[PDB]
Amino acid sequence: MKTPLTEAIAAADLRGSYLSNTELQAVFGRFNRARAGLEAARAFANNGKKWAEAAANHVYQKFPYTTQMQGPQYASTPEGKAKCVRDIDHYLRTISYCCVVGGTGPLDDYVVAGLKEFNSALGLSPSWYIAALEFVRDNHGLTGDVAGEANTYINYAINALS
Amino acid sequence: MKTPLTEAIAAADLRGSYLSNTELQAVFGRFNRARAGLEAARAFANNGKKWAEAAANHVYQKFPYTTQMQGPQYASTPEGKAKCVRDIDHYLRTISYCCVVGGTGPLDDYVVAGLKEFNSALGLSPSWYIAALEFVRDNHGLTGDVAGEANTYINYAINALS
Ligand SMILES: *[C@H](C)C1=C(C)C(=O)N[C@@H]1Cc1[nH]c(/C=C2N=C(/C=C3/NC(=O)C(CC)=C3C)C(C)=C\2CCC(=O)O)c(CCC(=O)O)c1C
Ligand SMILES: *[C@H](C)C1=C(C)C(=O)N[C@@H]1Cc1[nH]c(/C=C2N=C(/C=C3/NC(=O)C(CC)=C3C)C(C)=C\2CCC(=O)O)c(CCC(=O)O)c1C
């Protein structure tokens, strides 16, 4: 998949030239955010399970039909509910990868070139996952630079599902 | 193109796990090596053509026939000599990329894949290039961890060409 480093080398290789100082300065300056993105990667790995399970609960309360209705796409069973926390934990895992990379690549390949394609042959609602992500955005308790990265990718995923 | 960061994420994404404490430690301690990777890239971007000029001349001297022989693969004309400089510059350009990334990726794609399978049809000798590569190694004037990264990758190119 793509990262801004893989993109910058790919572009400079296509025109057969070295990376100029200005292209090389945008690699020097993204090491401030990538240091912050490594604390966010270590924060997501620490509380991800509990955040995902707490996020699942909010969705169940916000959309009570999901826990009582039919059964193919609905969390009517305790097995279906387990699958919801796993689906949510997966977003949190992909968002952590984006923070380590300093780009949207991991999400671009999971949601845009992934989820938005086959959900026509599944029928789950994006709103269930936007609410889950809004809950983890407003309840993670992260600092400043660390919060910056986590909130950039959580918000990119929310909008990718739009 | 493979980078050690894109293989790290790719690997954990197949297990459906967050990057562990120690997988993140192999990314953290790379900031000293990646800083040396960007200075080495700057050095190649600055003197590259001059080194490719001095390397080409050393080749015409070790192998005097490449200057006075046949015609298809030889630098027997000033148009042929200019191509030799260009092929050497390409190596130095691909080496500069590996330095920035912190992995052999750019070289694997250029030397192993492509060059070694298509040269069977072109007939050029890997020897002339190993000899131009050893000359930029022996007298680039670089020192410290910058010479380390540069020599790691210059030695990877020489290796792959065998
Ligand atoms: C969790 C928000 C949730 C609620 C509240 C609910 O009623 N159902 C649901 C849990 C659930 N998920 C599946 C199956 C899948 N979910 C997937 C992931 C998606 N994430 C999205 O944002 C989205 C819409 C764009 C998805 C489709 C996927 C890919 C699957 C199927 C493939 C798989 O992972 O196995 C189910 C039902 C099927 C099952 O239990 O496996 C439920 C109940
Ligand atoms: C420079 C070392 C040199 C000397 C001293 C010489 O006599 N010939 C040669 C310069 C030269 N190169 C080409 C054409 C190509 N060079 C390519 C790159 C390679 N890098 C290698 O390490 C290697 C061996 C494994 C190569 C073959 C390639 C891919 C080509 C062909 C395609 C292209 O880029 O044009 C020529 C021939 C002139 C021509 O343009 O075909 C010479 C003379």
Side-chain angles (χ1 to χ4, degrees), chain B residues 96-116:
Chain B
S96 77
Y97 302 149
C98 290
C99 287
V100 180
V101 123
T104 60
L107 281 174
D108 282 311
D109 294 20
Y110 179 58
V111 193
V112 193
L115 288 190
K116 254 283 175 178

Side-chain angles (χ1 to χ4, degrees), chain B residues 5 146 148 152:
Chain B
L5 183 50
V146 157
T152 291

Side-chain angles (χ1 to χ4, degrees), chain A residues 81-115:
Chain A
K81 276 194 187 67
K83 188 61 183 177
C84 193
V85 349
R86 296 176 67 82
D87 285 7
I88 290 166
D89 194 59
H90 191 331
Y91 263 101
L92 269 46
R93 295 200 311 262
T94 318
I95 284 158
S96 71
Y97 302 152
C98 289
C99 293
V100 187
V101 131
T104 60
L107 276 177
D108 281 317
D109 293 349
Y110 174 51
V111 192
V112 198
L115 264 41

